[PDB]
Amino acid sequence: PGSCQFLTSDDFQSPSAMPQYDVTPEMRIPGEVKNLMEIAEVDSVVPVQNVGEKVNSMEAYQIPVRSNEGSGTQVFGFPLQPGYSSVFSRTLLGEILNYYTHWSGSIKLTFMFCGSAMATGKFLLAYSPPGAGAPTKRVDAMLGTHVVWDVGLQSSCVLCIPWISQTHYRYVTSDEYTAGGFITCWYQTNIVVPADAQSSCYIMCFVSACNDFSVRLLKDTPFIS
Amino acid sequence: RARSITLGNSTITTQECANVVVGYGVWPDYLKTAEDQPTQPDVATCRFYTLDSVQWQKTSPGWWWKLPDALSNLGLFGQNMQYHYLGRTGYTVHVQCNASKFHQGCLLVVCVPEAEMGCATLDNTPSSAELLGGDSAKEFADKPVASGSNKLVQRVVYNAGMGVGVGNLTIFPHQWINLRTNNSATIVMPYTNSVPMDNMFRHNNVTLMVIPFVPLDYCPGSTTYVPITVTIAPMCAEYNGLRLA
Amino acid sequence: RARSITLGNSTITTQECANVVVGYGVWPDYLKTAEDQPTQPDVATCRFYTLDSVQWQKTSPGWWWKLPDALSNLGLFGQNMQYHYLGRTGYTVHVQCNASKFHQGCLLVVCVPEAEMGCATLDNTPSSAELLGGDSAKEFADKPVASGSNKLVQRVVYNAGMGVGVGNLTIFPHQWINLRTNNSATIVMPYTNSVPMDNMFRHNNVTLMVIPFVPLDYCPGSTTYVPITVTIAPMCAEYNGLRLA
Amino acid sequence: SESTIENFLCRSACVYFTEYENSGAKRYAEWVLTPRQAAQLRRKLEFFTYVRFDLELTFVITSTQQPSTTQNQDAQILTHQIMYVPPGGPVPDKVDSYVWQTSTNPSVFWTEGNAPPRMSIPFLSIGNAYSNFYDGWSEFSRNGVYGINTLNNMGTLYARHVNAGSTGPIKSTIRIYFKPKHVKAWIPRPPRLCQYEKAKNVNFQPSGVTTTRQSITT
Amino acid sequence: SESTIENFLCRSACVYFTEYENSGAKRYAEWVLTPRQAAQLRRKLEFFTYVRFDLELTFVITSTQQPSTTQNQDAQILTHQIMYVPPGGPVPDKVDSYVWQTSTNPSVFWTEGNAPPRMSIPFLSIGNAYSNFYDGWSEFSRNGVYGINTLNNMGTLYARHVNAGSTGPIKSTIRIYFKPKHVKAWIPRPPRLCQYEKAKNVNFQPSGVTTTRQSITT
């Protein structure tokens, strides 16, 4: 039992249709891929503003920041599940993760303030632990794992969120994931610009991976119709 | 280039040169009566508590935040004050202010110990509501507070509410902020009190005053305010032991 | 002579000979994925939590207390379960029973892991209200629970609600209490689960069952009950790190 | 020596029997891998709390000529396809679906008249051990059913006829054998005593402790 | 470990399904070797610019008795011939041609009822790597089509019935499986995002970047 059967997933030796034929030797072509993990470690722009017709344009990536009406108002926010999430399911990381059924590891997030060289402000990037819900106000966000980011001194702030793992089987689409954390941005201070300088400025986000990342049980991609 | 200082969960951005001002040449170290008076230290309490920003405008007298009272409602420090009774703590103010090169002004950041305020009416003392402001800064005043049958704290900016010359407040640990040179101020305050441990709800150890000596000036078109931002970190705080010898 | 065992604030009295029953020959030690899965231990949580006493009378089937659920409302353990998500813990039951020399009976103190209870109605599963009892023990029943359109947990004493023979429950860490010899029972339970860490509000690690095999008997004039008393101490409990790598 | 768990839980047990045809409404078989349907093996597995093992599946496929009145028949050899859908994988909605062609489902093609087809499935839990008994809810919310952990998912099994052999009707029966391998068991627990009712729960009808006798001195 | 290209691009994928008969107009099958027809494998291959690999072809041939009215049937065993025409080789214009006999086309004869036929084709490029993407013209002249290098020619595949078994009509279906081996990949490039339209070009319909959400603070 178990012989004279064709199993798609088997590794046997096959008789060569064309023997006695010298294959061309290999050459040195730059950039040889050894593992898929290396691809998942390149920072990719994240469409945070995928709201309405924003996706069918170029403004989906840029995050709008306005000095007016932002004493303590939230700037942005999204759950922390790469694959299966509108904001991260289409990046390089998310596209590699949509092939495996089980993945665990750490995620790196980089924010780059793209404004004048004369604009100064502060932001309050907060990380909610998996079970805990997204913060209601700026105080709730401060009483946690925050990072006060000053854009006058540093033009780019980097995070390294851990405890990131598969939250569901197959494919699900849901806002506010129960077993996933939330990253939110709050206006600690307003954008202070001199005369003859635009006060409306934009931010951008880049998602990457880390050395401690695992991916098992490869499956089919759900983006093919 | 900037820097990052991670205390516990919190992380804050500061300049490579910070010119820290240690209070009286003393770093806020721990306490150096056996079973009769057991003491237990708390560590996680230490972290960066960022208070609400205040908008500094042309017509702005000043502000004042009581260091024990300000954190009485935020995180572990707010909680510990309700649970334990006696406690001694040290502080690390981080007054930061961001404005362009086309703004001009000057601020005095001073940590005053035992800042006993005066009262509009000489006969009575100020009410705790007009004296203590929680989760919000208290502002000074340009003109004198009208005296009457009230408990309004005297809040004129020049007398400072303590009835002294505001030009002599420099005697206390302080730091100036010239909008054309300095952009921040760091002051480390040791624990200053007659007793080793004191009740934190009945006595304010230190008072933080930020008064602009030179008015903010800008040309029409620039942002019409400057968001001063204050960060407080409790240092070497210990509380009484609730155990049984 | 007696003894005193002080864990944290709590202190409890025990016999010189306690004949402790380590669960599976394993002491509940700590855990032996770097930055990807940070873990933080909690110590103060360990202490003696004394649950409400239960009166053991002649017509008394038995009781059952879910070890994670019972402390879900008491002190730090109740709090930590709400704050942190994943947690692994070990226990130390201290079932003590005090009755005179003129009382007679026998009890089985057994710690059952993954005690999945049955339901009166075969079609559905028992409701969490009839399954989980917080700050209060759940009792067994003499006669079978009437089946119908309900979610009543099967609670007959002989089947034990798990649908087995109650004489074979000895396979699990247990201890007998003969009112003429033994007066207490100590059982140390290690952490038994498929995963290193589990959610404590969605899964009960261990179940404590106390069933009297021999009915309490006494002559008219003695106290008509026997106050069984249970003490639980969480051991080597650790929770997930809420920091940022 | 015969009491080792390797000699106690490694017996080829038949756990499923069905029939599919080349014509008509019934055209394929499906069976979510689950070991709780056969009571003879369930009762042996329920001696321990957590068991970790590997599976050797053996399929016995036999085709009988259904009675019919179609004239001029001359059948060819029948070829069957058994597609094993791994946990979190696409499942066919019909016989001639496009899911039978997916490459991540390891299907095995077998031609009638040879040794029976057989494939081995490794430990598929994302955890460290399958849990025979679960004392929790599937989901944190009240919606989650009690005692059903989503960590014992072994996948599903679909079978069909690659081609219709003849012009007449043919019915093919498939028997599945379960053989656990490399079995490790932890925390032994008491035997069932009561009879089994469903396959999804431990619900039971209260029964006596043992069988009776005339007297205590008998 | 499962993310190595050897474990990511070595899955048996079905890339062709057709049917040929012993009588009638349809009498043989043909399929130019090209890996761009199945989108599930094309999308995986299009993660890299140049890929060098070897091919293991597995054919599943099943014959069904076509409905007919021919009396007195008694079929014999069917024998099939799968002729693999190497690049730059003669191709048959009909079933009973003289090209099926040529000795440089490695055909494989297989008798119905055994293990499926299988042959392995080595790297057939005259260059050093197959080019998934080409940014040039096939010919120097304007006549040359854009993005179609003549260096990715893997040959063609013809199948037929060696003999007519019975006197009645029989239809035989052939499924082809593609299994790349010894895969080396260079220059990784971004995933498709858009849906595929044709097999010969990268032409597409402009689509959004991702799926939408209620708001930026949601």
PDB file of N, CA and C in Angstrom, chain B residues 67-122:
ATOM      1  N   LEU B  67       4.456  70.611  41.422  1.00  0.00           N
ATOM      2  CA  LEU B  67       5.011  69.313  40.946  1.00  0.00           C
ATOM      3  C   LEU B  67       4.320  68.078  41.537  1.00  0.00           C
ATOM      4  N   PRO B  68       4.030  67.943  42.852  1.00  0.00           N
ATOM      5  CA  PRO B  68       3.284  66.766  43.330  1.00  0.00           C
ATOM      6  C   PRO B  68       1.832  66.736  42.827  1.00  0.00           C
ATOM      7  N   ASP B  69       1.138  67.878  42.854  1.00  0.00           N
ATOM      8  CA  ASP B  69      -0.292  67.967  42.444  1.00  0.00           C
ATOM      9  C   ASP B  69      -0.481  67.685  40.953  1.00  0.00           C
ATOM     10  N   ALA B  70       0.439  68.135  40.099  1.00  0.00           N
ATOM     11  CA  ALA B  70       0.242  68.001  38.636  1.00  0.00           C
ATOM     12  C   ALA B  70       0.098  66.527  38.246  1.00  0.00           C
ATOM     13  N   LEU B  71       0.877  65.643  38.869  1.00  0.00           N
ATOM     14  CA  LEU B  71       0.850  64.203  38.504  1.00  0.00           C
ATOM     15  C   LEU B  71      -0.158  63.450  39.381  1.00  0.00           C
ATOM     16  N   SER B  72      -0.870  64.152  40.265  1.00  0.00           N
ATOM     17  CA  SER B  72      -1.892  63.507  41.131  1.00  0.00           C
ATOM     18  C   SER B  72      -3.147  63.210  40.315  1.00  0.00           C
ATOM     19  N   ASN B  73      -3.126  62.168  39.479  1.00  0.00           N
ATOM     20  CA  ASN B  73      -4.247  61.755  38.583  1.00  0.00           C
ATOM     21  C   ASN B  73      -3.664  61.004  37.383  1.00  0.00           C
ATOM     22  N   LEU B  74      -2.335  60.988  37.248  1.00  0.00           N
ATOM     23  CA  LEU B  74      -1.712  60.321  36.074  1.00  0.00           C
ATOM     24  C   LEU B  74      -0.899  59.087  36.483  1.00  0.00           C
ATOM     25  N   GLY B  75      -1.266  57.930  35.923  1.00  0.00           N
ATOM     26  CA  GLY B  75      -0.561  56.640  36.075  1.00  0.00           C
ATOM     27  C   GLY B  75      -0.381  56.169  37.506  1.00  0.00           C
ATOM     28  N   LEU B  76       0.765  55.529  37.765  1.00  0.00           N
ATOM     29  CA  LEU B  76       1.147  54.969  39.091  1.00  0.00           C
ATOM     30  C   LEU B  76       1.335  56.085  40.122  1.00  0.00           C
ATOM     31  N   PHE B  77       1.965  57.192  39.731  1.00  0.00           N
ATOM     32  CA  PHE B  77       2.214  58.299  40.685  1.00  0.00           C
ATOM     33  C   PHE B  77       0.875  58.770  41.271  1.00  0.00           C
ATOM     34  N   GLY B  78      -0.141  58.957  40.427  1.00  0.00           N
ATOM     35  CA  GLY B  78      -1.468  59.371  40.921  1.00  0.00           C
ATOM     36  C   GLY B  78      -2.042  58.316  41.848  1.00  0.00           C
ATOM     37  N   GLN B  79      -1.851  57.039  41.498  1.00  0.00           N
ATOM     38  CA  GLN B  79      -2.365  55.887  42.285  1.00  0.00           C
ATOM     39  C   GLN B  79      -1.600  55.758  43.606  1.00  0.00           C
ATOM     40  N   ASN B  80      -0.268  55.664  43.543  1.00  0.00           N
ATOM     41  CA  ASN B  80       0.570  55.481  44.758  1.00  0.00           C
ATOM     42  C   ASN B  80       0.212  56.547  45.796  1.00  0.00           C
ATOM     43  N   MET B  81       0.041  57.797  45.373  1.00  0.00           N
ATOM     44  CA  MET B  81      -0.305  58.886  46.322  1.00  0.00           C
ATOM     45  C   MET B  81      -1.599  58.545  47.074  1.00  0.00           C
ATOM     46  N   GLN B  82      -2.555  57.879  46.418  1.00  0.00           N
ATOM     47  CA  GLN B  82      -3.813  57.475  47.104  1.00  0.00           C
ATOM     48  C   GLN B  82      -3.571  56.267  48.022  1.00  0.00           C
ATOM     49  N   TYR B  83      -2.739  55.306  47.617  1.00  0.00           N
ATOM     50  CA  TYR B  83      -2.542  54.073  48.428  1.00  0.00           C
ATOM     51  C   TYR B  83      -1.607  54.351  49.606  1.00  0.00           C
ATOM     52  N   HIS B  84      -0.306  54.489  49.341  1.00  0.00           N
ATOM     53  CA  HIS B  84       0.688  54.774  50.410  1.00  0.00           C
ATOM     54  C   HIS B  84       0.413  56.148  51.023  1.00  0.00           C
ATOM     55  N   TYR B  85       0.920  56.396  52.229  1.00  0.00           N
ATOM     56  CA  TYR B  85       0.715  57.701  52.912  1.00  0.00           C
ATOM     57  C   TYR B  85       1.978  58.564  52.797  1.00  0.00           C
ATOM     58  N   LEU B  86       3.090  58.142  53.411  1.00  0.00           N
ATOM     59  CA  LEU B  86       4.282  58.974  53.391  1.00  0.00           C
ATOM     60  C   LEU B  86       5.104  58.652  52.151  1.00  0.00           C
ATOM     61  N   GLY B  87       5.661  59.689  51.516  1.00  0.00           N
ATOM     62  CA  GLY B  87       6.495  59.481  50.314  1.00  0.00           C
ATOM     63  C   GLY B  87       7.461  60.626  50.056  1.00  0.00           C
ATOM     64  N   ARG B  88       8.685  60.315  49.614  1.00  0.00           N
ATOM     65  CA  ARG B  88       9.683  61.364  49.266  1.00  0.00           C
ATOM     66  C   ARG B  88      10.119  61.167  47.811  1.00  0.00           C
ATOM     67  N   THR B  89      10.173  62.243  47.016  1.00  0.00           N
ATOM     68  CA  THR B  89      10.484  62.092  45.567  1.00  0.00           C
ATOM     69  C   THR B  89      11.351  63.242  45.044  1.00  0.00           C
ATOM     70  N   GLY B  90      12.040  63.031  43.921  1.00  0.00           N
ATOM     71  CA  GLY B  90      12.850  64.086  43.278  1.00  0.00           C
ATOM     72  C   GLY B  90      12.347  64.263  41.859  1.00  0.00           C
ATOM     73  N   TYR B  91      12.642  65.382  41.194  1.00  0.00           N
ATOM     74  CA  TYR B  91      12.033  65.594  39.854  1.00  0.00           C
ATOM     75  C   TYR B  91      13.070  65.907  38.768  1.00  0.00           C
ATOM     76  N   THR B  92      12.634  65.956  37.505  1.00  0.00           N
ATOM     77  CA  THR B  92      13.505  66.271  36.342  1.00  0.00           C
ATOM     78  C   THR B  92      12.679  67.003  35.282  1.00  0.00           C
ATOM     79  N   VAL B  93      12.448  68.310  35.456  1.00  0.00           N
ATOM     80  CA  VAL B  93      11.628  69.100  34.489  1.00  0.00           C
ATOM     81  C   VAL B  93      12.315  69.128  33.118  1.00  0.00           C
ATOM     82  N   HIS B  94      11.515  69.143  32.047  1.00  0.00           N
ATOM     83  CA  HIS B  94      12.021  69.113  30.678  1.00  0.00           C
ATOM     84  C   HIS B  94      11.245  70.110  29.815  1.00  0.00           C
ATOM     85  N   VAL B  95      11.191  71.367  30.268  1.00  0.00           N
ATOM     86  CA  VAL B  95      10.431  72.422  29.532  1.00  0.00           C
ATOM     87  C   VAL B  95      11.040  72.626  28.143  1.00  0.00           C
ATOM     88  N   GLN B  96      10.298  72.274  27.091  1.00  0.00           N
ATOM     89  CA  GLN B  96      10.754  72.427  25.716  1.00  0.00           C
ATOM     90  C   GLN B  96       9.796  73.345  24.977  1.00  0.00           C
ATOM     91  N   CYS B  97      10.339  74.144  24.071  1.00  0.00           N
ATOM     92  CA  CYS B  97       9.596  75.184  23.381  1.00  0.00           C
ATOM     93  C   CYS B  97      10.076  75.256  21.942  1.00  0.00           C
ATOM     94  N   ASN B  98       9.149  75.189  20.988  1.00  0.00           N
ATOM     95  CA  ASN B  98       9.518  75.150  19.576  1.00  0.00           C
ATOM     96  C   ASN B  98       8.914  76.334  18.838  1.00  0.00           C
ATOM     97  N   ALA B  99       9.782  77.169  18.272  1.00  0.00           N
ATOM     98  CA  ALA B  99       9.387  78.312  17.468  1.00  0.00           C
ATOM     99  C   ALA B  99      10.473  78.577  16.437  1.00  0.00           C
ATOM    100  N   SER B 100      10.074  79.190  15.325  1.00  0.00           N
ATOM    101  CA  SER B 100      10.957  79.387  14.187  1.00  0.00           C
ATOM    102  C   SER B 100      12.029  80.428  14.496  1.00  0.00           C
ATOM    103  N   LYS B 101      12.844  80.725  13.482  1.00  0.00           N
ATOM    104  CA  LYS B 101      13.856  81.766  13.602  1.00  0.00           C
ATOM    105  C   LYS B 101      13.274  83.164  13.484  1.00  0.00           C
ATOM    106  N   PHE B 102      12.015  83.289  13.075  1.00  0.00           N
ATOM    107  CA  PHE B 102      11.387  84.583  12.880  1.00  0.00           C
ATOM    108  C   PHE B 102      10.527  84.997  14.066  1.00  0.00           C
ATOM    109  N   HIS B 103      10.665  84.255  15.169  1.00  0.00           N
ATOM    110  CA  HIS B 103       9.970  84.547  16.451  1.00  0.00           C
ATOM    111  C   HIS B 103      11.015  85.080  17.438  1.00  0.00           C
ATOM    112  N   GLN B 104      10.608  85.922  18.392  1.00  0.00           N
ATOM    113  CA  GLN B 104      11.569  86.492  19.378  1.00  0.00           C
ATOM    114  C   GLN B 104      10.903  86.568  20.755  1.00  0.00           C
ATOM    115  N   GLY B 105      11.641  86.224  21.814  1.00  0.00           N
ATOM    116  CA  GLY B 105      11.098  86.245  23.160  1.00  0.00           C
ATOM    117  C   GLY B 105      12.129  85.744  24.145  1.00  0.00           C
ATOM    118  N   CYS B 106      11.714  85.592  25.408  1.00  0.00           N
ATOM    119  CA  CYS B 106      12.624  85.090  26.472  1.00  0.00           C
ATOM    120  C   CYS B 106      11.765  84.583  27.632  1.00  0.00           C
ATOM    121  N   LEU B 107      12.099  83.425  28.204  1.00  0.00           N
ATOM    122  CA  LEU B 107      11.274  82.823  29.282  1.00  0.00           C
ATOM    123  C   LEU B 107      12.170  82.485  30.470  1.00  0.00           C
ATOM    124  N   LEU B 108      11.640  82.530  31.694  1.00  0.00           N
ATOM    125  CA  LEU B 108      12.435  82.052  32.854  1.00  0.00           C
ATOM    126  C   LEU B 108      11.767  80.778  33.366  1.00  0.00           C
ATOM    127  N   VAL B 109      12.483  79.655  33.351  1.00  0.00           N
ATOM    128  CA  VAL B 109      11.938  78.389  33.917  1.00  0.00           C
ATOM    129  C   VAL B 109      12.555  78.236  35.304  1.00  0.00           C
ATOM    130  N   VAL B 110      11.766  78.392  36.370  1.00  0.00           N
ATOM    131  CA  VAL B 110      12.355  78.383  37.742  1.00  0.00           C
ATOM    132  C   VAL B 110      11.622  77.360  38.615  1.00  0.00           C
ATOM    133  N   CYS B 111      12.361  76.529  39.351  1.00  0.00           N
ATOM    134  CA  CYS B 111      11.724  75.571  40.291  1.00  0.00           C
ATOM    135  C   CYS B 111      11.775  76.168  41.696  1.00  0.00           C
ATOM    136  N   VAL B 112      10.635  76.618  42.215  1.00  0.00           N
ATOM    137  CA  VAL B 112      10.583  77.306  43.540  1.00  0.00           C
ATOM    138  C   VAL B 112      10.143  76.319  44.628  1.00  0.00           C
ATOM    139  N   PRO B 113      10.887  76.166  45.744  1.00  0.00           N
ATOM    140  CA  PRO B 113      10.484  75.282  46.837  1.00  0.00           C
ATOM    141  C   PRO B 113       9.655  76.062  47.869  1.00  0.00           C
ATOM    142  N   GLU B 114       8.589  75.441  48.383  1.00  0.00           N
ATOM    143  CA  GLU B 114       7.683  76.056  49.346  1.00  0.00           C
ATOM    144  C   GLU B 114       7.217  77.425  48.864  1.00  0.00           C
ATOM    145  N   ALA B 115       6.593  77.426  47.693  1.00  0.00           N
ATOM    146  CA  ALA B 115       6.021  78.646  47.135  1.00  0.00           C
ATOM    147  C   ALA B 115       4.655  78.893  47.771  1.00  0.00           C
ATOM    148  N   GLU B 116       4.684  79.537  48.929  1.00  0.00           N
ATOM    149  CA  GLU B 116       3.445  79.891  49.606  1.00  0.00           C
ATOM    150  C   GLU B 116       2.854  81.140  48.969  1.00  0.00           C
ATOM    151  N   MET B 117       1.689  80.998  48.349  1.00  0.00           N
ATOM    152  CA  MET B 117       1.085  82.094  47.613  1.00  0.00           C
ATOM    153  C   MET B 117       0.342  83.039  48.551  1.00  0.00           C
ATOM    154  N   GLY B 118       0.109  84.269  48.081  1.00  0.00           N
ATOM    155  CA  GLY B 118      -0.638  85.256  48.888  1.00  0.00           C
ATOM    156  C   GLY B 118      -2.122  85.218  48.567  1.00  0.00           C
ATOM    157  N   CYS B 119      -2.913  86.089  49.203  1.00  0.00           N
ATOM    158  CA  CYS B 119      -4.380  86.128  48.958  1.00  0.00           C
ATOM    159  C   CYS B 119      -4.824  87.568  48.685  1.00  0.00           C
ATOM    160  N   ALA B 120      -5.796  87.751  47.784  1.00  0.00           N
ATOM    161  CA  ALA B 120      -6.305  89.075  47.463  1.00  0.00           C
ATOM    162  C   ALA B 120      -6.742  89.786  48.731  1.00  0.00           C
ATOM    163  N   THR B 121      -7.577  89.103  49.519  1.00  0.00           N
ATOM    164  CA  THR B 121      -8.057  89.649  50.813  1.00  0.00           C
ATOM    165  C   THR B 121      -7.032  89.271  51.889  1.00  0.00           C
ATOM    166  N   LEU B 122      -6.482  90.268  52.581  1.00  0.00           N
ATOM    167  CA  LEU B 122      -5.433  90.065  53.614  1.00  0.00           C
ATOM    168  C   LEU B 122      -5.966  89.206  54.769  1.00  0.00           C
TER     169      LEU B 122
END
